[PDB]
Design a protein around this nucleic acid. Structure first.
Lengths: 148, 80, 140, 113
RNA sequence: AGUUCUAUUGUGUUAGCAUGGUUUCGA
RNA sequence: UAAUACAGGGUUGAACUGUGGGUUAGUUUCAAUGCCCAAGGCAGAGCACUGGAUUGGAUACCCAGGGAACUGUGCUCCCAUUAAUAAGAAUC
RNA sequence: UUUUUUUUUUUUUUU
RNA sequence: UUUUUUUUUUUUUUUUUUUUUUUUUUUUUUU
RNA sequence: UUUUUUUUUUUUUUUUUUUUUUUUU
């Protein structure tokens, strides 16, 4: 979770329409020491694939809050492996009710970054998020007025 | 402006509270008056008439409360 | 004869395209995201009634709307109570197609706001909060 | 007679500007046979609603200042118009100095008991 | 009854300010 | 009708004054709306005026357009004429 | 289609 | 025609004083 | 330039150029 934060700088690139206008953005520092192999060591696999292999082998031992963070971080290093993210689609559907509000926000970012458009899962996640937000009232220019 | 939140309550029950809110602030009365132009002479007489009918309504409303209260308790006061 | 509950002008332009085709999308290409908030703004009048959907998660961007002419009601039939009830049903039915469950309700008047509220609860569209901000004049 | 003025600055106002503003004001005071009383500061203040002033932008807070003076009654109009032309000052008001109620002699035991 | 002093001021006149219905505009 | 400047009226406290008054022309100010003249304009409203309805035989009722009239130190008081239908004294 | 009427018309928008 | 946003111009009574509480202290014979 | 909606391992994260231009699912 903290590795992505270190390799991130906030900048204010010019806007698309008006060049005088500015909008704050995020730029991530490239990593050139995580994808290459290690022939010298016994484990010829890279540091990135090794983490993924163990995560999928022991997915049950991880809780819901401990699963979305690890998946959200793998997609931040430009991991274009749609097959890796397609294994968790069946696991998440059967455990949707046990998902917290924070878990929703930490899972959509991952699929969108990797260009993995899934309609059967995104349609269901919309209802869960709205149901949790059914007890918070927020108005304009005042913020949250009544909560629970 | 009025804002209400629904929490463990049916929509019909909540909608009945906001409806009565406008009566206190005369939201409906003011909305219709501005739609049509009213002559100043008419307002001169209408403003005065409302100062005699409304006060009388409050006194009669309290009298009805005593009748209902005494009906469920019977008894009656006298020159004792 | 051959009555249809829709807009004849738009029906003539049909070319077999699916629903929600002309609506603009986002950078990611998703029409709607799971994390969003909606607030329908309803405005009443004497003859007609309008009710558009406003998305609070897109800087108050409109998605779609409906009117008395979009349900096959014209002439004096709009003044009837059925005109308001029919409009509410279309919004509720169309809401399930997009994938929204909770939508707020906002209105300025209280005259024709009874038929729309009843129709929403008969399909599944719930109510989370009721907002009323009458812009009463503050001067003569 | 004595007079009071409450000036609400903006976030875009530095200490440089504040000194200049007050110096200008003192000119008028002296002109009309007057003298400054005292100058104090109230710090920042939170605004209930957004302030939209033309050709200035939008602000949510500002620095509240207070200064007492005394001059001819005819000097109020000149002072009031000068503040409006100057930048930074988004809102201001002039209040006459009262005998009992004042920010000089009566500043203790307000909220407590 | 009337004059002076002191407390009190939605009574006459008054140029810039704040808020608001309507109206107007769309890098 | 929040702020500020000029000057009135009403209530209470002290001092002073020691019958100062009621009504009022051959008198003098102010006075809604409409009209003449003048200044004017870029909002919200509308008389006249061919602009979409009439009838069981005639119409201004119901929409829309619409160049008069709406801020005056002036000319000026016709009215259902501005806080009852008496301006004062005595009996609570 | 919009506006309006007890009802209707005139008027306005044109992919 | 609906919604939204960000600074042009004209205009200024919506909120704010009250059970009409002095010997009740005042309105005109009769039908 | 103006910021809209949220959370709590932090001062954090997504969106971003004016909308809307069709019933039964």
């Amino acid at each position: 979770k903290s590795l992505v934060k270190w390799s991130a700088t906030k900048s204010p690139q010019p806007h698309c329409k008006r060049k005088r206008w500015r909008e704050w953005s995020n730029t991530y520092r490239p990593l050139p020491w995580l994808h290459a192999p290690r022939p010298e060591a016994r484990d010829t696999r890279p540091l990135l694939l090794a983490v993924c292999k163990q995560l999928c082998k022991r997915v049950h031992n991880f809780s819901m809050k401990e699963l979305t963070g690890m998946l959200r971080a793998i997609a931040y290093v430009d991991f274009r492996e749609p097959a890796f993210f397609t294994v968790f689609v069946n696991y998440l559907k059967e455990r949707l009710g046990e998902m917290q509000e924070e878990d929703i926000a930490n899972v959509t970012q991952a699929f969108n970054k990797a260009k993995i458009e899934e309609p059967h899962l995104f349609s269901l996640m919309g209802k869960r998020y709205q149901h949790l937000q059914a007890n918070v009232m927020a108005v304009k220019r005042r913020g949250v007025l009544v909560r629970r | 402006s009025c804002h209400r939140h629904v929490f463990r309550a049916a929509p019909a029950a909540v909608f009945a509270s906001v409806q009565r809110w406008g009566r206190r602030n005369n939201v409906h009365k003011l909305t219709l008056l501005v739609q049509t132009y009213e002559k100043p002479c008419v307002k001169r007489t209408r403003i005065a008439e409302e100062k005699a009918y409304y006060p009388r309504w409050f006194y009669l409303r309290y009298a009805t409360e005593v009748i209902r209260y005494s009906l469920k308790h019977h008894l009656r006061l006298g020159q004792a | 004869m051959r009555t249809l509950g829709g807009h004849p002008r738009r029906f003539k332009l049909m070319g077999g395209r699916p629903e929600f085709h002309h609506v603009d999308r986002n950078k990611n290409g998703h029409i709607i995201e799971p994390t969003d908030k909606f607030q329908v703004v309803i405005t009443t009048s004497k003859n007609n009634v309008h009710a558009q959907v406003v998305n609070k998660s897109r800087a108050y961007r409109t998605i779609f709307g409906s009117f008395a002419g979009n349900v096959g009601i014209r002439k004096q039939a709009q003044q009837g109570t059925q005109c308001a009830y029919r409009i509410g049903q279309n919004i509720a039915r169309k809401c399930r197609r997009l994938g929204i469950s909770q939508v707020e309700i906002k209105f300025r008047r209280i005259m024709r706001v009874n038929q729309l509220l009843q129709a929403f609860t008969a399909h599944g569209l719930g109510v989370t909060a009721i907002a009323h901000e009458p812009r009463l004049p503050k001067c003569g | 007679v004595f007079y009071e003025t409450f000036v609400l600055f903006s976030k875009r106002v530095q200490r440089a500007d504040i000194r200049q503003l007050l110096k200008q004001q003192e000119a008028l005071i002296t002109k009309h046979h007057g003298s400054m009383l005292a100058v104090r500061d109230l710090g920042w203040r939170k605004t209930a609603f957004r302030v939209i002033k033309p050709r200035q932008g939008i602000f949510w807070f500002g620095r509240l200042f207070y200064f007492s003076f005394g001059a001819n009654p005819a000097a109020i109009t000149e002072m009031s118009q000068s503040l409006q032309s100057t930048n930074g000052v988004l809102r201001h008001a002039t209040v006459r100095m009262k005998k009992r109620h004042n920010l000089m002699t009566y500043n203790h035991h307000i909220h407590a008991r």
